[PDB]
Amino acid sequence: RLKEECEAGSRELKRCKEENYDLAMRLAHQSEEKGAALMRNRDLQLEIDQLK
Amino acid sequence: RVQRLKEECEAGSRELKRCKEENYDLAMRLAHQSEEKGAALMRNRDLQLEIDQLK
């Protein structure tokens, strides 16, 4: 009754910890890509301001 | 032995609850950063089109 639910919980904890590491890596990757896109945006806005 | 595995199981159920809450937070922050990157790339395309008409 509780032995089976506790074995299932420890397997779910193993998967949750794997997902946590995966989410952290994906978050760091998206933050770098967002930073690169925003830098390109600043440079383009500066170009427009000089022409207009 | 019975009381030891009971505690260990209760501790794991609490750690899983914590991990799922952290994972939900990371997922929402990941979704936010991806949306912001996407929005910036779309503005970049529009700005490049504007520049090409002015130079």
Short mmCIF file of C-alpha atoms in Angstrom, two decimals:
data_model
loop_
_atom_site.label_atom_id
_atom_site.label_comp_id
_atom_site.label_asym_id
_atom_site.label_seq_id
_atom_site.Cartn_x
_atom_site.Cartn_y
_atom_site.Cartn_z
CA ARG A 1 0.00 0.00 0.00
CA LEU A 2 2.58 2.57 1.13
CA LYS A 3 5.63 0.57 -0.09
CA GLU A 4 4.35 0.74 -3.72
CA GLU A 5 3.41 4.47 -3.50
CA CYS A 6 6.84 5.21 -1.99
CA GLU A 7 8.70 3.27 -4.74
CA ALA A 8 6.63 5.22 -7.36
CA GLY A 9 7.45 8.51 -5.58
CA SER A 10 11.23 7.82 -5.60
CA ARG A 11 11.06 7.06 -9.36
CA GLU A 12 9.08 10.29 -9.93
CA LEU A 13 11.66 12.24 -7.83
CA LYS A 14 14.50 10.88 -10.06
CA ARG A 15 12.61 12.09 -13.20
CA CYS A 16 11.79 15.49 -11.60
CA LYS A 17 15.49 16.12 -10.76
CA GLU A 18 16.48 15.25 -14.39
CA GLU A 19 13.80 17.67 -15.65
CA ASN A 20 15.08 20.39 -13.27
CA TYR A 21 18.60 20.16 -14.76
CA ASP A 22 17.17 20.19 -18.31
CA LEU A 23 14.99 23.27 -17.54
CA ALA A 24 17.97 25.12 -16.02
CA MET A 25 20.12 24.49 -19.15
CA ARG A 26 17.28 25.53 -21.50
CA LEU A 27 16.68 28.70 -19.42
CA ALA A 28 20.39 29.72 -19.56
CA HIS A 29 20.40 29.06 -23.38
CA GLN A 30 17.25 31.16 -24.00
CA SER A 31 18.63 34.00 -21.79
CA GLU A 32 21.84 34.12 -23.90
CA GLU A 33 19.78 34.10 -27.14
CA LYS A 34 17.44 36.82 -25.76
CA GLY A 35 20.49 38.93 -24.83
CA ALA A 36 21.93 38.52 -28.34
CA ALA A 37 18.58 39.50 -29.99
CA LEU A 38 18.24 42.57 -27.75
CA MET A 39 21.79 43.68 -28.58
CA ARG A 40 21.02 43.41 -32.33
CA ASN A 41 17.81 45.44 -31.68
CA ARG A 42 19.76 48.24 -29.94
CA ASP A 43 22.23 48.44 -32.87
CA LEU A 44 19.39 48.57 -35.45
CA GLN A 45 17.54 51.27 -33.48
CA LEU A 46 20.74 53.36 -33.39
CA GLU A 47 21.06 53.01 -37.24
CA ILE A 48 17.42 54.16 -37.78
CA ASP A 49 17.83 57.18 -35.46
CA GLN A 50 20.80 58.38 -37.59
CA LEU A 51 18.82 58.14 -40.87
CA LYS A 52 15.45 59.54 -39.68
CA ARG B 1 13.51 -0.72 9.97
CA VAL B 2 9.75 0.00 9.41
CA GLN B 3 9.87 3.44 11.08
CA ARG B 4 13.11 4.30 9.19
CA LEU B 5 11.62 3.66 5.70
CA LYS B 6 8.44 5.57 6.73
CA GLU B 7 10.49 8.73 7.46
CA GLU B 8 12.59 8.32 4.26
CA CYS B 9 9.40 8.02 2.20
CA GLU B 10 7.81 11.09 3.87
CA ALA B 11 11.04 13.06 3.18
CA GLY B 12 11.01 12.01 -0.50
CA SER B 13 7.34 13.03 -0.90
CA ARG B 14 8.26 16.50 0.45
CA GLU B 15 11.36 16.78 -1.79
CA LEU B 16 9.26 15.80 -4.87
CA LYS B 17 6.69 18.53 -4.00
CA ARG B 18 9.57 21.07 -3.79
CA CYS B 19 11.09 19.90 -7.07
CA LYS B 20 7.76 20.16 -8.97
CA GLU B 21 7.20 23.73 -7.65
CA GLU B 22 10.74 24.73 -8.75
CA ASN B 23 10.25 23.08 -12.15
CA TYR B 24 6.96 25.01 -12.72
CA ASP B 25 8.76 28.29 -11.91
CA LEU B 26 11.64 27.47 -14.29
CA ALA B 27 9.15 26.51 -17.05
CA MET B 28 7.32 29.86 -16.74
CA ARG B 29 10.59 31.80 -16.76
CA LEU B 30 11.80 29.77 -19.82
CA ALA B 31 8.51 30.51 -21.62
CA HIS B 32 8.95 34.25 -20.79
CA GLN B 33 12.57 34.48 -22.05
CA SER B 34 11.69 32.59 -25.29
CA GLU B 35 8.71 34.94 -25.90
CA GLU B 36 10.94 38.01 -25.29
CA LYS B 37 13.59 36.68 -27.67
CA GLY B 38 10.91 36.02 -30.31
CA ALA B 39 9.48 39.51 -29.93
CA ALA B 40 12.96 41.09 -30.30
CA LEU B 41 13.65 39.05 -33.48
CA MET B 42 10.36 40.28 -35.03
CA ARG B 43 11.19 43.93 -34.17
CA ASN B 44 14.67 43.38 -35.69
CA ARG B 45 13.12 42.28 -38.98
CA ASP B 46 10.82 45.37 -39.06
CA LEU B 47 13.71 47.73 -38.22
CA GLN B 48 15.89 46.23 -40.98
CA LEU B 49 13.07 46.79 -43.49
CA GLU B 50 12.81 50.48 -42.37
CA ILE B 51 16.60 51.01 -42.74
CA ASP B 52 16.64 49.52 -46.26
CA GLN B 53 14.05 52.16 -47.35
CA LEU B 54 16.05 55.10 -45.88
CA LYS B 55 19.67 54.43 -46.98
#
